[PDB]
JSON list of C-alpha atoms in Angstrom, two decimals:
[
{"chain": "A", "resi": 4, "resn": "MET", "atom": "CA", "xyz": [106.04, -139.57, -58.36]},
{"chain": "A", "resi": 5, "resn": "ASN", "atom": "CA", "xyz": [103.35, -139.41, -61.00]},
{"chain": "A", "resi": 6, "resn": "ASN", "atom": "CA", "xyz": [102.77, -136.19, -63.17]},
{"chain": "A", "resi": 7, "resn": "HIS", "atom": "CA", "xyz": [99.31, -136.45, -64.35]},
{"chain": "A", "resi": 8, "resn": "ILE", "atom": "CA", "xyz": [99.56, -136.38, -68.12]},
{"chain": "A", "resi": 9, "resn": "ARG", "atom": "CA", "xyz": [97.52, -138.65, -70.19]},
{"chain": "A", "resi": 10, "resn": "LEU", "atom": "CA", "xyz": [97.79, -138.83, -74.08]},
{"chain": "A", "resi": 11, "resn": "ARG", "atom": "CA", "xyz": [95.09, -140.56, -76.15]},
{"chain": "A", "resi": 12, "resn": "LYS", "atom": "CA", "xyz": [94.26, -140.71, -79.78]},
{"chain": "A", "resi": 13, "resn": "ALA", "atom": "CA", "xyz": [91.25, -138.47, -80.38]},
{"chain": "A", "resi": 14, "resn": "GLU", "atom": "CA", "xyz": [88.75, -140.57, -82.05]},
{"chain": "A", "resi": 15, "resn": "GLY", "atom": "CA", "xyz": [87.22, -139.74, -85.44]},
{"chain": "A", "resi": 16, "resn": "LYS", "atom": "CA", "xyz": [87.55, -136.59, -87.46]},
{"chain": "A", "resi": 17, "resn": "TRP", "atom": "CA", "xyz": [88.50, -133.48, -85.50]},
{"chain": "A", "resi": 18, "resn": "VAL", "atom": "CA", "xyz": [88.26, -129.99, -86.80]},
{"chain": "A", "resi": 19, "resn": "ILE", "atom": "CA", "xyz": [89.67, -126.50, -85.93]},
{"chain": "A", "resi": 20, "resn": "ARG", "atom": "CA", "xyz": [88.00, -123.41, -87.19]},
{"chain": "A", "resi": 21, "resn": "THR", "atom": "CA", "xyz": [87.17, -119.77, -86.65]},
{"chain": "A", "resi": 22, "resn": "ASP", "atom": "CA", "xyz": [83.92, -118.22, -87.17]},
{"chain": "A", "resi": 23, "resn": "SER", "atom": "CA", "xyz": [84.74, -117.77, -90.86]},
{"chain": "A", "resi": 24, "resn": "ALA", "atom": "CA", "xyz": [87.37, -120.30, -92.06]},
{"chain": "A", "resi": 25, "resn": "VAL", "atom": "CA", "xyz": [88.37, -124.00, -91.47]},
{"chain": "A", "resi": 26, "resn": "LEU", "atom": "CA", "xyz": [91.99, -124.10, -90.45]},
{"chain": "A", "resi": 27, "resn": "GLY", "atom": "CA", "xyz": [92.36, -127.90, -89.98]},
{"chain": "A", "resi": 28, "resn": "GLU", "atom": "CA", "xyz": [90.78, -131.42, -90.22]},
{"chain": "A", "resi": 29, "resn": "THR", "atom": "CA", "xyz": [92.58, -134.48, -88.88]},
{"chain": "A", "resi": 30, "resn": "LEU", "atom": "CA", "xyz": [92.05, -138.15, -88.17]},
{"chain": "A", "resi": 31, "resn": "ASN", "atom": "CA", "xyz": [95.12, -138.16, -85.96]},
{"chain": "A", "resi": 32, "resn": "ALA", "atom": "CA", "xyz": [94.48, -135.57, -83.27]},
{"chain": "A", "resi": 33, "resn": "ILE", "atom": "CA", "xyz": [95.96, -136.31, -79.79]},
{"chain": "A", "resi": 34, "resn": "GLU", "atom": "CA", "xyz": [94.05, -135.65, -76.61]},
{"chain": "A", "resi": 35, "resn": "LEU", "atom": "CA", "xyz": [96.23, -134.43, -73.73]},
{"chain": "A", "resi": 36, "resn": "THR", "atom": "CA", "xyz": [94.65, -134.29, -70.32]},
{"chain": "A", "resi": 37, "resn": "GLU", "atom": "CA", "xyz": [96.64, -132.95, -67.23]},
{"chain": "A", "resi": 38, "resn": "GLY", "atom": "CA", "xyz": [95.01, -134.03, -63.98]},
{"chain": "A", "resi": 39, "resn": "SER", "atom": "CA", "xyz": [91.36, -133.06, -63.93]},
{"chain": "A", "resi": 40, "resn": "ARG", "atom": "CA", "xyz": [91.77, -130.05, -66.43]},
{"chain": "A", "resi": 41, "resn": "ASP", "atom": "CA", "xyz": [89.78, -130.01, -69.56]},
{"chain": "A", "resi": 42, "resn": "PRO", "atom": "CA", "xyz": [91.51, -131.95, -72.20]},
{"chain": "A", "resi": 43, "resn": "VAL", "atom": "CA", "xyz": [93.42, -130.01, -74.93]},
{"chain": "A", "resi": 44, "resn": "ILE", "atom": "CA", "xyz": [93.41, -131.25, -78.54]},
{"chain": "A", "resi": 45, "resn": "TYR", "atom": "CA", "xyz": [96.66, -131.28, -80.44]},
{"chain": "A", "resi": 46, "resn": "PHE", "atom": "CA", "xyz": [96.66, -131.22, -84.22]},
{"chain": "A", "resi": 47, "resn": "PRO", "atom": "CA", "xyz": [99.37, -132.46, -86.53]},
{"chain": "A", "resi": 48, "resn": "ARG", "atom": "CA", "xyz": [101.00, -129.64, -88.41]},
{"chain": "A", "resi": 49, "resn": "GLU", "atom": "CA", "xyz": [100.63, -131.21, -91.74]},
{"chain": "A", "resi": 50, "resn": "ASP", "atom": "CA", "xyz": [96.91, -131.11, -91.25]},
{"chain": "A", "resi": 51, "resn": "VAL", "atom": "CA", "xyz": [96.77, -127.38, -90.37]},
{"chain": "A", "resi": 52, "resn": "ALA", "atom": "CA", "xyz": [96.53, -124.54, -92.99]},
{"chain": "A", "resi": 53, "resn": "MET", "atom": "CA", "xyz": [99.90, -123.06, -91.74]},
{"chain": "A", "resi": 54, "resn": "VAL", "atom": "CA", "xyz": [99.96, -120.58, -94.62]},
{"chain": "A", "resi": 55, "resn": "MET", "atom": "CA", "xyz": [97.66, -118.48, -92.41]},
{"chain": "A", "resi": 56, "resn": "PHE", "atom": "CA", "xyz": [100.02, -118.53, -89.38]},
{"chain": "A", "resi": 57, "resn": "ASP", "atom": "CA", "xyz": [102.87, -116.26, -88.25]},
{"chain": "A", "resi": 58, "resn": "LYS", "atom": "CA", "xyz": [105.29, -117.37, -85.54]},
{"chain": "A", "resi": 59, "resn": "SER", "atom": "CA", "xyz": [105.12, -115.08, -82.44]},
{"chain": "A", "resi": 60, "resn": "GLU", "atom": "CA", "xyz": [107.70, -113.65, -80.18]},
{"chain": "A", "resi": 61, "resn": "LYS", "atom": "CA", "xyz": [105.88, -115.12, -77.15]},
{"chain": "A", "resi": 62, "resn": "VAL", "atom": "CA", "xyz": [107.01, -118.30, -75.45]},
{"chain": "A", "resi": 63, "resn": "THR", "atom": "CA", "xyz": [105.87, -119.87, -72.28]},
{"chain": "A", "resi": 64, "resn": "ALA", "atom": "CA", "xyz": [107.56, -122.68, -70.21]},
{"chain": "A", "resi": 65, "resn": "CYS", "atom": "CA", "xyz": [105.82, -125.67, -68.81]},
{"chain": "A", "resi": 66, "resn": "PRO", "atom": "CA", "xyz": [107.84, -127.84, -66.32]},
{"chain": "A", "resi": 67, "resn": "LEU", "atom": "CA", "xyz": [106.21, -131.01, -67.65]},
{"chain": "A", "resi": 68, "resn": "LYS", "atom": "CA", "xyz": [105.90, -130.36, -71.42]},
{"chain": "A", "resi": 69, "resn": "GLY", "atom": "CA", "xyz": [108.65, -127.88, -72.23]},
{"chain": "A", "resi": 70, "resn": "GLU", "atom": "CA", "xyz": [108.73, -124.59, -74.18]},
{"chain": "A", "resi": 71, "resn": "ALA", "atom": "CA", "xyz": [105.46, -123.53, -76.00]},
{"chain": "A", "resi": 72, "resn": "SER", "atom": "CA", "xyz": [106.07, -121.56, -79.21]},
{"chain": "A", "resi": 73, "resn": "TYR", "atom": "CA", "xyz": [103.08, -119.38, -80.19]},
{"chain": "A", "resi": 74, "resn": "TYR", "atom": "CA", "xyz": [101.50, -118.40, -83.48]},
{"chain": "A", "resi": 75, "resn": "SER", "atom": "CA", "xyz": [99.10, -115.72, -84.65]},
{"chain": "A", "resi": 76, "resn": "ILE", "atom": "CA", "xyz": [96.40, -116.67, -87.14]},
{"chain": "A", "resi": 77, "resn": "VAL", "atom": "CA", "xyz": [95.43, -114.23, -89.89]},
{"chain": "A", "resi": 78, "resn": "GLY", "atom": "CA", "xyz": [91.77, -114.19, -91.16]},
{"chain": "A", "resi": 79, "resn": "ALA", "atom": "CA", "xyz": [88.95, -112.13, -92.81]},
{"chain": "A", "resi": 80, "resn": "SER", "atom": "CA", "xyz": [88.55, -110.16, -89.57]},
{"chain": "A", "resi": 81, "resn": "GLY", "atom": "CA", "xyz": [92.22, -109.56, -88.70]},
{"chain": "A", "resi": 82, "resn": "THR", "atom": "CA", "xyz": [94.89, -111.24, -86.59]},
{"chain": "A", "resi": 83, "resn": "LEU", "atom": "CA", "xyz": [94.14, -113.69, -83.77]},
{"chain": "A", "resi": 84, "resn": "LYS", "atom": "CA", "xyz": [97.14, -112.76, -81.75]},
{"chain": "A", "resi": 85, "resn": "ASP", "atom": "CA", "xyz": [98.96, -115.71, -80.16]},
{"chain": "A", "resi": 86, "resn": "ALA", "atom": "CA", "xyz": [95.91, -117.91, -80.67]},
{"chain": "A", "resi": 87, "resn": "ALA", "atom": "CA", "xyz": [97.75, -121.21, -81.28]},
{"chain": "A", "resi": 88, "resn": "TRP", "atom": "CA", "xyz": [100.70, -122.89, -79.73]},
{"chain": "A", "resi": 89, "resn": "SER", "atom": "CA", "xyz": [103.09, -125.90, -80.12]},
{"chain": "A", "resi": 90, "resn": "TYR", "atom": "CA", "xyz": [105.61, -127.82, -78.13]},
{"chain": "A", "resi": 91, "resn": "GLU", "atom": "CA", "xyz": [108.21, -128.06, -80.80]},
{"chain": "A", "resi": 92, "resn": "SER", "atom": "CA", "xyz": [110.85, -129.77, -78.68]},
{"chain": "A", "resi": 93, "resn": "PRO", "atom": "CA", "xyz": [108.83, -131.55, -76.05]},
{"chain": "A", "resi": 94, "resn": "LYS", "atom": "CA", "xyz": [110.18, -132.85, -72.74]},
{"chain": "A", "resi": 95, "resn": "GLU", "atom": "CA", "xyz": [110.69, -136.56, -72.39]},
{"chain": "A", "resi": 96, "resn": "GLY", "atom": "CA", "xyz": [107.52, -138.73, -72.61]},
{"chain": "A", "resi": 97, "resn": "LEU", "atom": "CA", "xyz": [105.62, -136.12, -74.70]},
{"chain": "A", "resi": 98, "resn": "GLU", "atom": "CA", "xyz": [107.30, -136.57, -78.11]},
{"chain": "A", "resi": 99, "resn": "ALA", "atom": "CA", "xyz": [104.03, -137.66, -79.61]},
{"chain": "A", "resi": 100, "resn": "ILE", "atom": "CA", "xyz": [102.85, -134.11, -79.75]},
{"chain": "A", "resi": 101, "resn": "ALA", "atom": "CA", "xyz": [106.16, -132.65, -81.12]},
{"chain": "A", "resi": 102, "resn": "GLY", "atom": "CA", "xyz": [105.23, -129.84, -83.51]},
{"chain": "A", "resi": 103, "resn": "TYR", "atom": "CA", "xyz": [101.42, -130.33, -83.19]},
{"chain": "A", "resi": 104, "resn": "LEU", "atom": "CA", "xyz": [99.29, -127.25, -82.74]},
{"chain": "A", "resi": 105, "resn": "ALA", "atom": "CA", "xyz": [96.71, -126.54, -79.94]},
{"chain": "A", "resi": 106, "resn": "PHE", "atom": "CA", "xyz": [94.26, -123.62, -79.96]},
{"chain": "A", "resi": 107, "resn": "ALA", "atom": "CA", "xyz": [92.93, -120.87, -77.75]},
{"chain": "A", "resi": 108, "resn": "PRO", "atom": "CA", "xyz": [89.12, -121.43, -77.30]},
{"chain": "A", "resi": 109, "resn": "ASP", "atom": "CA", "xyz": [88.28, -117.76, -76.83]},
{"chain": "A", "resi": 110, "resn": "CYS", "atom": "CA", "xyz": [88.54, -117.30, -80.61]},
{"chain": "A", "resi": 111, "resn": "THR", "atom": "CA", "xyz": [88.62, -120.72, -82.27]},
{"chain": "A", "resi": 112, "resn": "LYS", "atom": "CA", "xyz": [86.42, -123.74, -82.11]},
{"chain": "A", "resi": 113, "resn": "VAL", "atom": "CA", "xyz": [87.64, -127.29, -81.82]},
{"chain": "A", "resi": 114, "resn": "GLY", "atom": "CA", "xyz": [85.51, -130.32, -81.95]},
{"chain": "A", "resi": 115, "resn": "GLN", "atom": "CA", "xyz": [84.68, -133.81, -83.32]},
{"chain": "A", "resi": 116, "resn": "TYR", "atom": "CA", "xyz": [82.84, -133.85, -86.73]}
]
């Protein structure tokens, strides 16, 4: 009865940024792939510039991972509404990403350095 979630250590230095600021660098990103979906990179919170983030009212439920809390990111151009999320109390098997942040690609760029 396999769910299809694979977690790997993202190799090398991974960065999260906007078009105008660098929000995070880490050597300990986790890559999460669910089935044949594009992998999503999760960043440890200590490596993200959280001072630029406001917790949002939005939440979403995922049967496999748990409840996603959302955050808005403030920058030079304004607020990126609900542009980041985190599974702050993940379901069993996914505790490795507890509190890590992942990011909306429509307005952020994530990638290996």
